[PDB]
Ligand binder design. Sequence first.
Ligand SMILES: N#Cc1cccc(-n2cc(-c3n[nH]c4cc(Cl)c(N[C@@H]5CCNC5)cc34)cn2)c1
Length: 261
Amino acid sequence: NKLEDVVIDRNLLILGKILGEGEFGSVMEGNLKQEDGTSLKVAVKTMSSQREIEEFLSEAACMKDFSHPNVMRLLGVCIEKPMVILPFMKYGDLHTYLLYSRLETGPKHIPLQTLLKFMVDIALGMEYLSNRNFLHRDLAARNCMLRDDMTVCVADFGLMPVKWIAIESLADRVYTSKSDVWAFGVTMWEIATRGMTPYPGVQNHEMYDYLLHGHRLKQPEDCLDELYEIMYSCWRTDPLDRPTFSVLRLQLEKLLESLPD
Ligand SMILES: N#Cc1cccc(-n2cc(-c3n[nH]c4cc(Cl)c(N[C@@H]5CCNC5)cc34)cn2)c1
């Protein structure tokens, strides 16, 4: 109905350079002019009936009413394939941030307190979205962004990463919150391994069988048994046995409490 406020005129937007090309869309830098007269740096992510366009912009309306420190906000949508206008993060994605942390010019040895704080951030975000019954469908360290206060916020939620998908989705083609829990365990594995590609030595087409024989992601070298238990709880065969994002968040929070400053 009156939810046309999600639509923003193209005249208020000024596109720039390509910061990254995918296959389902591209991400460009841009400036957004506002009612205040000031302009902000924004990322514009590009992308057949009038019933699916409505669903895209309505779901977009829900995302526009979301407001959580660890969840990205939806600034708007232009219609010139559609274009999704979100805030701009100078520090970039956590995956590249960790891989850079392993290099000398980048960050220093990121301690387990900072890694765990990242995981707690993503846990609070995904839990916030779970309480509102919103599904991410694409959760990875590449899709988690770092903010100006060095906090991680979830992104790319709404409407291959096979190694991030759960068995029930690989087989029954059903996607629930527990599949997002699986993706959260894989993301924790990434943050602990600081950017290692999941399931080394196993190609993308062998995933299901590999998981159908009970083989999950192995424990990293420096990882702790508590962290690997938290990850392993997410990769269980039956979603009912998997923990919820609230329980996971509290677990990681207490584990971070027990560590020296
Ligand atoms: N050179 C370079 C360089 C340097 C610093 C930062 C960036 N940079 C920022 C963004 C970005 N700002 N706000 C976003 C919102 C979403 Cl939703 C997404 N989604 C992505 C699609 C899949 N992976 C995430 C990205 C952004 C993307 N690049 C580039």
